[PDB]
Amino acid sequence: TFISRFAPDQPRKGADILVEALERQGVETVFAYPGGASMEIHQALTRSSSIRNVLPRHEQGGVFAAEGYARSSGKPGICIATSGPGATNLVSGLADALLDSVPLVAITGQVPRRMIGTDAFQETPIVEVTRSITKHNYLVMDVEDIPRIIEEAFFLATSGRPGPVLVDVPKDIQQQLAIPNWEQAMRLPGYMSRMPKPPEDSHLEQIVRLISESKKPVLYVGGGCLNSSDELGRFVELTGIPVASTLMGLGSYPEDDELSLHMLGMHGTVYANYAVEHSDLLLAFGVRFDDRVTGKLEAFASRAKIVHIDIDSAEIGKNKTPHVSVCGDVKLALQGMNKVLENRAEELKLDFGVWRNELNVQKQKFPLSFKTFGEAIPPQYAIKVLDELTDGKAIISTGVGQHQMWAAQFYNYKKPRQWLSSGGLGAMGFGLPAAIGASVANPDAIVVDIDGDGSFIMNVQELATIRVENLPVKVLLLNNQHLGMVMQLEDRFYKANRAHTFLGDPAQEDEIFPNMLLFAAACGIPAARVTKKADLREAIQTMLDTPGPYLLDVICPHQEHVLPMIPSGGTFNDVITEGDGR
Amino acid sequence: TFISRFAPDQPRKGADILVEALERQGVETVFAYPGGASMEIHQALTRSSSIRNVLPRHEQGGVFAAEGYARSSGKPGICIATSGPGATNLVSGLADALLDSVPLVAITGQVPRRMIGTDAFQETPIVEVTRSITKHNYLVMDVEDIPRIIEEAFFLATSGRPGPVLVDVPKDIQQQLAIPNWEQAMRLPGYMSRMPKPPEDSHLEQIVRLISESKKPVLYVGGGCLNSSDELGRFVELTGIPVASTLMGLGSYPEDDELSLHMLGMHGTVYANYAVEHSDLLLAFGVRFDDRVTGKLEAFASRAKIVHIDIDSAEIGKNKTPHVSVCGDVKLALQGMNKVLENRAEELKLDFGVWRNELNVQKQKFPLSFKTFGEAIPPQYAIKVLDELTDGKAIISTGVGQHQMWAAQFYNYKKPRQWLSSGGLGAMGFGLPAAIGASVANPDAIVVDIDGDGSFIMNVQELATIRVENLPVKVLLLNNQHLGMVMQLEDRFYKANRAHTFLGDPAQEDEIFPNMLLFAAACGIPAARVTKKADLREAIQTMLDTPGPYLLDVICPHQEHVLPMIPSGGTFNDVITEGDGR
Ligand SMILES: Cc1cc2nc3c(=O)[nH]c(=O)nc-3n(C[C@H](O)[C@H](O)[C@H](O)COP(=O)(O)OP(=O)(O)OC[C@H]3O[C@@H](n4cnc5c(N)ncnc54)[C@H](O)[C@@H]3O)c2cc1C
Ligand SMILES: Cc1cc2nc3c(=O)[nH]c(=O)nc-3n(C[C@H](O)[C@H](O)[C@H](O)COP(=O)(O)OP(=O)(O)OC[C@H]3O[C@@H](n4cnc5c(N)ncnc54)[C@H](O)[C@@H]3O)c2cc1C
Ligand SMILES: COc1cc(OC)nc(Oc2cccc(Oc3nc(OC)cc(OC)n3)c2C(=O)O)n1
Ligand SMILES: COc1cc(OC)nc(Oc2cccc(Oc3nc(OC)cc(OC)n3)c2C(=O)O)n1
Ligand SMILES: Cc1ncc(Cn2c(C)c(CCOP(=O)(O)OP(=O)(O)O)sc2=O)c(N)n1
Ligand SMILES: Cc1ncc(Cn2c(C)c(CCOP(=O)(O)OP(=O)(O)O)sc2=O)c(N)n1
Ligand SMILES: [Mg+2]
Ligand SMILES: [Mg+2]
């Protein structure tokens, strides 16, 4: 029983209809940056008592914060921008949310209807630009269509395979008066008809059948699981199959468990890629078979019968052709297969201890390793220390680079929606704003940002947003004075020829630049820098215990390399296990 | 006689062909941020001895710096980005360069040809996204086409009406070996055939004819003039017609001259809009009749015969229908009309002293005015002081907002290419990177950035670029703790209801936030803050005399309003001449 602030017979502005339409969808947090074409919307947001606005300092920071809000909770993220330059600053966020299937609803202002197509002031064809980087977009041509389009936007963004949905609203529609009809039926015939049905017992019983016939099975878990945390763990108890995870599926199965193969792929563990290489049954749940995971598709699980479950029928059979396939929710497939395994438990007699022992051998021979040089701080050890002091209960958001991979390898995530990282697009500067959105969605959680000196400075303006909104965002900056991921490839494949990968000052080459502590000091945030490995544990303990935001600059030797590394398009036999830039 | 670093029979990489193709076009400065899909290009840039790379800290700062490089010199600006998130950060810059007709050539990396359309790693359909915000774009499908596409890109970007041209290059093309053929003929049949011809004497002699028949003529000068600085001044000597300028045409005719009406339009002077309102002949040279200038098109020059000269045949007759029109270069039209006026000088007997005196009356009755409150610093006076101490010889780049309009009103630009401001798109954060590009193109010039606290913080990361590259960029920050332009409209049309327009900290409301001095201190840039009007002259003198970069924080009362102001879509009779938020 929703309670409106307006009478059922009282005409109100279109912008007031839009805000009420958001309140009916359960929205309580938006990330809106004001502008000329959206002042009516901002005026209507102040009249709302149930919607809080987090004002960012850059629209790209607003859409990245909406992603973190969605990645860390499951709700859709809502950001609002003005026309022209406000809308074009959302492009990096929209393309990222599509590639990583993040529920997102972006609302942008627009010049009045009678001015579109005239090269007007702050006018850009935002619908034609974003048509290829959104799940769907709309252009509101009448104030009557507002209640229906908003309903379709939150539906398309959260149902099926989630994604971003943009809604462009002209200024004259925000000012027009009307009486909204909240009983509108959605105009999505072809989308709802193609929606996946619950899985058939005919398909599910052949999956359980293929498991008992298999000797070396591996679970290939990805970003589609997330909501299926419990169902997946229950499925592993009954089968005892090792679990390999993608960058997006971290936390779906706890990393501290003994059955965990951790991450597989290009920078995946040797034992996880080994299990896939010498498997006969591959259970690919919620994955899309990225080239970061497979490399050469002909050598990826070459001797394995492949089972693929995905809610998007377009993804099944795109790169790798499976034997058995199931189009639907992985959460329902696991529930249906758990029932088959409990009833016919003694009939199956499932035991893979020989396959697990063969992997435990490789898990002991080729584990994740890092080197300590004197008193310098190895970045991997800094994350292990953060893992200890937070007990693995912290929400981690990262940038893109070496620090990103190390944040995945050397932290054991226990639950999903704990790991926020741009994996598909790989957008730098994603970290700090994503931590802002997660801290708003999870106020009582430990939100720690693991950025690099290059990624951190891109959206460094959002430190003002952190202080103004008083968020307990912890920034664990791994400063290596370089663009690490690009520098690592220069050492291997370009004879260490530096090509604009140094971020410091060449005049004072042995001086840390910039002085990131003064960046936090400008925004009134307490900061500290640690350089010696002995002082590391006390420095991170200070960051966590200090109430409110905190910045910790951790200086690292730039010669470190992320390992292991299967080169681009290579096979498991081409894996690199040792090497650095010294 | 170009000298290559390779033999005519020596195969080289496609990336090396691309760099040599740039050297043949006269490129000597690029703004490239490295990434995975463009490392081959960065490797080839180090091998070049004639091309300098300015590494930014954000790709949006790189494209905005390429605009300032082009706006302040006339050369085309060249920025280079990686695929995926690197390319999508150029969108705000591409849309801006198109709306303001800035010659721009953007090169982006891309996943190899065999991976486009597979949702690959860091893969975005950059050609389909930017098709509507660029003059043209390309997708290189063969290493053979590189010498031709680069030639067509620099041709399309600089000829006719300038604009941005994007070139997407897959990674496998950068690595492929080939022998370039530099004798390729461009494949632009339809574009070159539609190119404008030199103006006919039949058209030009009717223009001179309409001038002698007119009693109240006004010159409507815009961004198309720029290159025609001398020809325009010579044309005014012979006719004696007052010159009104757009935001983009500032400097085309010197603002310190007595015949100058300064800027017209929404925030234009009362006397400039008056001359247009009561004119009988309007000479519109290099303008596009924006709604920021005209408002209601039926009342704009309602009693005037309109002469329009533009190099784009699509712009003539778009909004306002002219009597006489000339499609071609305004520089050639002025040269042809100057010859007509010198020969038939005594035959015409041109004198408009009665019309000029009628305007000099309005110029004295309604001049640009500002109020001084106690010892507070009025922002308009700060720009007047900067105008004095630099003798109007400084290259000025601004953000978007109140400080932008005041930088246009209270500074008398003497030559074109001195005023760098996003007018068409109106993108915030454009200022500081644009000052970087101008300082690289004009090393011995006085480059001063007039930013607002909101616009400055968006691309504040570029201060590291200023220090590392050791550029003498002066930052005149007009901090009013608010988003001024949005706050001004709240006071007039929304009863001063603040809707997320305050940038400071609500906990410490009377504390300047953020402390912008520490932002410069982090990047090792000398900074200072001035608050009292008496200390203002000494503070700006310190900024200019200090070698290298300098930041000056100028605190202003936020209640100031930009005046005059013709409201949106209004006429000259609706002009607002007084008012503020007190
Ligand atoms: C520098 C860098 C290095 C990287 N290295 C690696 C690496 O080594 N290993 C690695 O794995 N990744 C790596 N990545 C990330 C990589 O690009 C992809 O993000 C990742 O490989 C793909 O994740 P995914 O398979 O879980 O698919 P996702 O992008 O997470 O998509 C989820 C899939 O499940 C489906 N799905 C969604 N919801 C449901 C549901 N409710 N029910 C059923 N199905 C659903 C979706 O349709 C989709 O097909 C790296 C990224 C970067 C920037
Ligand atoms: C907050 C804000 C307030 C603003 N207020 C105002 C205002 O009050 N007044 C105002 O004028 N603007 C204002 N603007 C800017 C405005 O949006 C436009 O930028 C401006 O009005 C249009 O400039 P222009 O007429 O010179 O056309 P331009 O954008 O500069 O285009 C140049 C025209 O000349 C043509 N041309 C180009 N080269 C040549 C050549 N070589 N020969 C012949 N023709 C050529 C082009 O085809 C084009 O038609 C404001 C912007 C902002 C952000
Ligand atoms: C942020 O500060 C500013 C500045 C400014 O011009 C200086 N304008 C706006 O609002 C718009 C934003 C975008 C387009 C606009 O054009 C417009 N909007 C209308 O709304 C009804 C009507 C209109 O008629 C010409 N033009 C307008 C406009 O308000 O003019 N905001
Ligand atoms: C599968 O075959 C190939 C071949 C190829 O070039 C011939 N490229 C790609 O994908 C990329 C797409 C974009 C950037 C790329 O380089 C790259 N890849 C990374 O993966 C971790 C990281 C990185 O650091 C910036 N650069 C790569 C890359 O695989 O080299 N795949
Ligand atoms: C916006 C953007 N630009 C460029 C890249 C390419 N890129 C770049 C430039 C990387 C180096 C990141 O440097 P960092 O300091 O932030 O992190 P590390 O040095 O620890 O790897 S990683 C990577 O994929 C990108 N992913 N996103
Ligand atoms: C990227 C972006 N976002 C929003 C806007 C809308 N906008 C905004 C938010 C303005 C206020 C600018 O604040 P400022 O501090 O930088 O300058 P002043 O307060 O002196 O006007 S002006 C304007 O057109 C914009 N033009 N560009
Ligand atoms: Mg780094
Ligand atoms: Mg301001």
CSV table of C-alpha atoms in Angstrom, one decimal, chain B residues 43-320:
chain,number,residue,atom,x,y,z
B,43,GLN,CA,56.8,1.3,-28.6
B,44,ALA,CA,57.0,3.0,-32.0
B,45,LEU,CA,56.6,6.5,-30.5
B,46,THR,CA,59.8,6.1,-28.5
B,47,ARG,CA,61.7,5.2,-31.8
B,48,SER,CA,60.5,8.5,-33.2
B,49,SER,CA,62.8,11.5,-32.6
B,50,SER,CA,60.4,14.2,-33.9
B,51,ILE,CA,57.2,13.3,-31.9
B,52,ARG,CA,56.8,14.2,-28.2
B,53,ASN,CA,54.3,12.4,-26.1
B,54,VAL,CA,52.6,14.2,-23.2
B,55,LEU,CA,51.4,11.4,-20.9
B,56,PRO,CA,48.2,12.6,-19.1
B,57,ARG,CA,46.6,11.0,-16.0
B,58,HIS,CA,43.1,10.4,-17.6
B,59,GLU,CA,42.1,9.9,-21.2
B,60,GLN,CA,39.5,12.6,-20.9
B,61,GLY,CA,42.3,14.9,-19.9
B,62,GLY,CA,44.2,13.7,-23.0
B,63,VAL,CA,41.5,14.6,-25.5
B,64,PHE,CA,40.8,17.9,-23.8
B,65,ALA,CA,44.5,18.7,-24.0
B,66,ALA,CA,44.4,17.9,-27.7
B,67,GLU,CA,41.5,20.4,-28.1
B,68,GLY,CA,43.5,23.1,-26.4
B,69,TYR,CA,46.5,22.3,-28.6
B,70,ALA,CA,44.2,22.8,-31.6
B,71,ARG,CA,42.2,25.7,-30.3
B,72,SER,CA,45.3,27.8,-29.4
B,73,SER,CA,47.4,27.1,-32.5
B,74,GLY,CA,45.3,26.0,-35.5
B,75,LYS,CA,47.1,22.7,-36.0
B,76,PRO,CA,45.0,19.5,-35.5
B,77,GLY,CA,45.2,17.8,-32.1
B,78,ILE,CA,46.2,14.2,-31.9
B,79,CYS,CA,45.4,12.0,-28.9
B,80,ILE,CA,45.9,8.2,-28.6
B,81,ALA,CA,44.1,5.8,-26.3
B,82,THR,CA,43.7,2.0,-25.8
B,83,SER,CA,40.7,-0.1,-26.5
B,84,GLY,CA,37.6,-0.4,-24.3
B,85,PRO,CA,37.8,1.9,-21.3
B,86,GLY,CA,40.5,4.1,-23.0
B,87,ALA,CA,38.3,4.8,-26.0
B,88,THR,CA,35.1,5.5,-24.0
B,89,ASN,CA,36.9,8.1,-22.0
B,90,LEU,CA,37.3,10.1,-25.2
B,91,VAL,CA,33.6,10.5,-25.8
B,92,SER,CA,33.2,13.8,-24.0
B,93,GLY,CA,36.1,15.2,-26.0
B,94,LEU,CA,34.9,14.0,-29.3
B,95,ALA,CA,31.4,15.4,-28.9
B,96,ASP,CA,32.9,18.7,-27.8
B,97,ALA,CA,35.2,19.0,-30.8
B,98,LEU,CA,32.4,18.3,-33.1
B,99,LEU,CA,30.0,20.9,-31.6
B,100,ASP,CA,32.8,23.6,-31.6
B,101,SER,CA,34.4,22.5,-35.0
B,102,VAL,CA,37.8,21.8,-33.6
B,103,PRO,CA,40.3,19.9,-35.8
B,104,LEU,CA,40.9,16.6,-34.0
B,105,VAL,CA,42.3,13.2,-34.9
B,106,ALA,CA,41.8,10.4,-32.3
B,107,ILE,CA,43.6,7.1,-32.6
B,108,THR,CA,42.4,4.2,-30.5
B,109,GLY,CA,43.6,0.6,-30.2
B,110,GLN,CA,41.3,-2.4,-30.7
B,111,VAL,CA,41.3,-6.1,-30.2
B,112,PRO,CA,42.6,-8.1,-33.2
B,113,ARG,CA,40.4,-8.3,-36.2
B,114,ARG,CA,39.3,-11.9,-35.5
B,115,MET,CA,37.9,-10.9,-32.1
B,116,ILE,CA,35.6,-8.0,-32.9
B,117,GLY,CA,32.0,-8.8,-32.1
B,118,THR,CA,32.8,-11.5,-29.4
B,119,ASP,CA,32.5,-9.3,-26.3
B,120,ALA,CA,36.2,-9.7,-26.0
B,121,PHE,CA,38.5,-8.3,-23.3
B,122,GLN,CA,38.5,-4.5,-23.3
B,123,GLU,CA,36.4,-4.6,-26.5
B,124,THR,CA,33.8,-1.9,-27.2
B,125,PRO,CA,32.2,-1.1,-30.6
B,126,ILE,CA,33.9,2.3,-30.7
B,127,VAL,CA,33.1,3.0,-34.4
B,128,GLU,CA,29.4,2.4,-33.9
B,129,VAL,CA,29.3,4.5,-30.7
B,130,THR,CA,31.1,7.6,-32.0
B,131,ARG,CA,29.5,7.6,-35.5
B,132,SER,CA,27.2,10.4,-34.4
B,133,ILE,CA,29.7,12.5,-32.5
B,134,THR,CA,32.5,12.6,-35.1
B,135,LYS,CA,32.9,14.1,-38.5
B,136,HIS,CA,34.0,10.6,-39.7
B,137,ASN,CA,35.6,7.5,-38.3
B,138,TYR,CA,37.5,4.5,-39.7
B,139,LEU,CA,38.2,0.9,-38.8
B,140,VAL,CA,41.5,-0.3,-40.2
B,141,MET,CA,41.0,-3.8,-41.7
B,142,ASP,CA,44.4,-4.1,-43.4
B,143,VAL,CA,47.9,-2.8,-42.7
B,144,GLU,CA,48.0,-1.7,-46.4
B,145,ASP,CA,45.3,1.0,-45.8
B,146,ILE,CA,47.2,2.8,-43.0
B,147,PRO,CA,49.0,5.4,-45.1
B,148,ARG,CA,45.7,6.3,-46.9
B,149,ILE,CA,43.4,6.4,-43.9
B,150,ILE,CA,45.8,8.7,-41.9
B,151,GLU,CA,45.9,11.0,-44.9
B,152,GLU,CA,42.1,11.1,-45.2
B,153,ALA,CA,41.8,11.6,-41.4
B,154,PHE,CA,44.0,14.7,-41.2
B,155,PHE,CA,42.3,16.0,-44.4
B,156,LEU,CA,38.7,15.6,-43.2
B,157,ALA,CA,39.6,17.0,-39.7
B,158,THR,CA,41.2,20.3,-41.0
B,159,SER,CA,39.4,21.0,-44.2
B,160,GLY,CA,35.9,22.6,-44.7
B,161,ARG,CA,34.2,22.8,-41.3
B,162,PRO,CA,36.8,21.2,-39.0
B,163,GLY,CA,35.9,18.3,-36.7
B,164,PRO,CA,37.1,15.2,-34.9
B,165,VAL,CA,38.1,12.1,-36.9
B,166,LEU,CA,38.5,8.7,-35.1
B,167,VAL,CA,40.7,5.9,-36.3
B,168,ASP,CA,40.4,2.5,-34.7
B,169,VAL,CA,43.4,0.2,-35.2
B,170,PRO,CA,43.3,-3.5,-34.2
B,171,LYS,CA,46.3,-5.0,-32.4
B,172,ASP,CA,47.1,-7.6,-35.0
B,173,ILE,CA,47.4,-4.8,-37.6
B,174,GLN,CA,49.9,-2.9,-35.4
B,175,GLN,CA,52.0,-6.1,-35.3
B,176,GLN,CA,51.7,-7.1,-39.0
B,177,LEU,CA,54.7,-6.4,-41.2
B,178,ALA,CA,54.4,-4.5,-44.5
B,179,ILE,CA,56.0,-2.0,-46.9
B,180,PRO,CA,53.9,1.2,-47.0
B,181,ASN,CA,52.9,2.9,-50.2
B,182,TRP,CA,52.9,6.6,-49.6
B,183,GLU,CA,51.5,7.4,-53.0
B,184,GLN,CA,47.9,6.3,-52.2
B,185,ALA,CA,45.1,8.4,-53.6
B,186,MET,CA,42.4,9.4,-51.1
B,187,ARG,CA,39.0,7.8,-51.5
B,188,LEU,CA,36.9,11.0,-50.9
B,189,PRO,CA,35.1,11.6,-54.2
B,190,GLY,CA,31.8,12.9,-52.8
B,191,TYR,CA,33.4,15.1,-50.1
B,192,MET,CA,35.8,16.9,-52.4
B,193,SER,CA,33.2,17.5,-55.1
B,194,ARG,CA,30.9,19.2,-52.5
B,195,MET,CA,33.7,21.4,-51.2
B,196,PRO,CA,33.0,25.1,-51.5
B,197,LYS,CA,34.5,27.1,-54.3
B,198,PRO,CA,35.9,30.7,-54.0
B,199,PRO,CA,33.2,33.2,-53.7
B,200,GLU,CA,31.7,34.8,-56.9
B,201,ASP,CA,32.0,38.5,-57.6
B,202,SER,CA,28.3,38.5,-58.4
B,203,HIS,CA,27.5,37.6,-54.8
B,204,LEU,CA,30.2,39.9,-53.2
B,205,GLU,CA,29.2,43.0,-55.1
B,206,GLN,CA,25.6,42.7,-53.9
B,207,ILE,CA,26.9,42.5,-50.3
B,208,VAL,CA,28.7,45.8,-50.7
B,209,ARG,CA,25.6,47.1,-52.4
B,210,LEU,CA,23.4,46.2,-49.5
B,211,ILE,CA,25.8,48.0,-47.1
B,212,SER,CA,25.5,51.4,-48.8
B,213,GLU,CA,21.7,51.1,-48.8
B,214,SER,CA,21.7,50.3,-45.0
B,215,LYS,CA,21.4,52.8,-42.2
B,216,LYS,CA,21.8,50.6,-39.1
B,217,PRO,CA,24.2,47.7,-39.9
B,218,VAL,CA,25.7,45.2,-37.4
B,219,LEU,CA,28.5,42.6,-37.8
B,220,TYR,CA,27.7,39.2,-36.3
B,221,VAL,CA,31.1,37.6,-35.9
B,222,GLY,CA,31.5,34.0,-34.7
B,223,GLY,CA,34.0,31.1,-34.4
B,224,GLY,CA,34.4,30.8,-38.2
B,225,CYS,CA,36.5,34.0,-38.4
B,226,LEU,CA,39.5,33.2,-36.2
B,227,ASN,CA,41.9,32.7,-39.1
B,228,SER,CA,40.5,35.9,-40.7
B,229,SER,CA,41.6,38.3,-38.0
B,230,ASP,CA,43.4,40.7,-40.3
B,231,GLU,CA,40.8,40.6,-43.1
B,232,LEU,CA,38.0,41.3,-40.6
B,233,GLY,CA,39.8,44.3,-39.1
B,234,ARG,CA,40.5,45.7,-42.6
B,235,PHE,CA,36.8,45.2,-43.5
B,236,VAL,CA,35.8,47.3,-40.4
B,237,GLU,CA,38.1,50.2,-41.3
B,238,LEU,CA,36.4,50.6,-44.7
B,239,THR,CA,32.8,50.2,-43.5
B,240,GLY,CA,32.9,51.4,-39.8
B,241,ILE,CA,30.3,48.9,-38.8
B,242,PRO,CA,30.1,47.8,-35.1
B,243,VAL,CA,31.2,44.3,-34.3
B,244,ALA,CA,29.2,41.9,-32.1
B,245,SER,CA,30.9,38.6,-31.3
B,246,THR,CA,29.8,35.2,-30.1
B,247,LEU,CA,31.4,33.2,-27.3
B,248,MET,CA,33.5,31.4,-29.9
B,249,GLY,CA,34.5,34.5,-31.9
B,250,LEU,CA,36.1,36.4,-29.0
B,251,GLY,CA,39.4,37.9,-30.2
B,252,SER,CA,38.5,37.9,-33.9
B,253,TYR,CA,37.9,41.6,-33.5
B,254,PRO,CA,39.8,43.2,-30.6
B,255,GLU,CA,37.6,43.9,-27.5
B,256,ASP,CA,39.5,47.0,-26.5
B,257,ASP,CA,38.5,48.8,-29.7
B,258,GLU,CA,35.8,51.5,-29.7
B,259,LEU,CA,33.9,49.8,-32.5
B,260,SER,CA,33.5,46.7,-30.4
B,261,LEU,CA,30.1,45.7,-29.0
B,262,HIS,CA,31.7,42.8,-27.2
B,263,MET,CA,29.7,39.6,-26.8
B,264,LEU,CA,26.0,39.3,-27.6
B,265,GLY,CA,23.5,36.6,-26.7
B,266,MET,CA,21.9,35.2,-23.5
B,267,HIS,CA,24.6,36.7,-21.2
B,268,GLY,CA,25.7,39.3,-23.8
B,269,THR,CA,25.9,43.0,-23.3
B,270,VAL,CA,22.7,45.1,-23.4
B,271,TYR,CA,24.1,47.3,-26.2
B,272,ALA,CA,25.2,44.3,-28.4
B,273,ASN,CA,21.8,42.7,-28.2
B,274,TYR,CA,20.3,46.2,-28.8
B,275,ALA,CA,22.2,46.7,-32.0
B,276,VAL,CA,20.9,43.4,-33.4
B,277,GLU,CA,17.3,44.1,-32.3
B,278,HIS,CA,17.1,47.4,-34.1
B,279,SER,CA,19.3,46.7,-37.1
B,280,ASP,CA,18.3,46.7,-40.8
B,281,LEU,CA,21.4,44.8,-42.1
B,282,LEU,CA,23.0,41.9,-40.2
B,283,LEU,CA,26.3,40.5,-41.5
B,284,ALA,CA,26.6,37.1,-39.9
B,285,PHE,CA,30.1,35.8,-40.6
B,286,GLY,CA,31.2,32.4,-39.3
B,287,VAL,CA,28.2,31.9,-37.0
B,288,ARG,CA,25.6,29.1,-36.6
B,289,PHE,CA,22.7,31.1,-35.0
B,290,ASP,CA,22.6,29.2,-31.7
B,291,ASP,CA,19.7,29.6,-29.4
B,292,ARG,CA,22.1,31.0,-26.9
B,293,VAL,CA,22.4,33.9,-29.2
B,294,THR,CA,19.0,34.2,-30.8
B,295,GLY,CA,16.5,33.0,-28.2
B,296,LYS,CA,13.1,33.4,-30.0
B,297,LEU,CA,14.1,33.3,-33.7
B,298,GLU,CA,11.1,35.4,-34.7
B,299,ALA,CA,12.2,38.4,-32.6
B,300,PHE,CA,16.0,38.0,-33.5
B,301,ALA,CA,16.9,40.8,-36.0
B,302,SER,CA,13.2,41.0,-36.9
B,303,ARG,CA,13.7,44.2,-38.9
B,304,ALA,CA,17.0,43.3,-40.5
B,305,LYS,CA,18.1,41.9,-43.9
B,306,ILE,CA,20.3,39.0,-43.0
B,307,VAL,CA,23.6,38.1,-44.8
B,308,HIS,CA,25.0,34.7,-43.9
B,309,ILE,CA,28.5,33.4,-44.9
B,310,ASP,CA,29.4,29.9,-43.9
B,311,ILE,CA,31.7,27.1,-45.2
B,312,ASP,CA,29.0,24.5,-44.4
B,313,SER,CA,26.0,24.6,-46.8
B,314,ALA,CA,24.0,22.7,-44.3
B,315,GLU,CA,24.1,25.7,-41.8
B,316,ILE,CA,22.8,28.3,-44.2
B,317,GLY,CA,19.1,28.5,-43.7
B,318,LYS,CA,18.9,26.1,-40.8
B,319,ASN,CA,17.2,28.3,-38.1
B,320,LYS,CA,17.0,31.8,-39.7
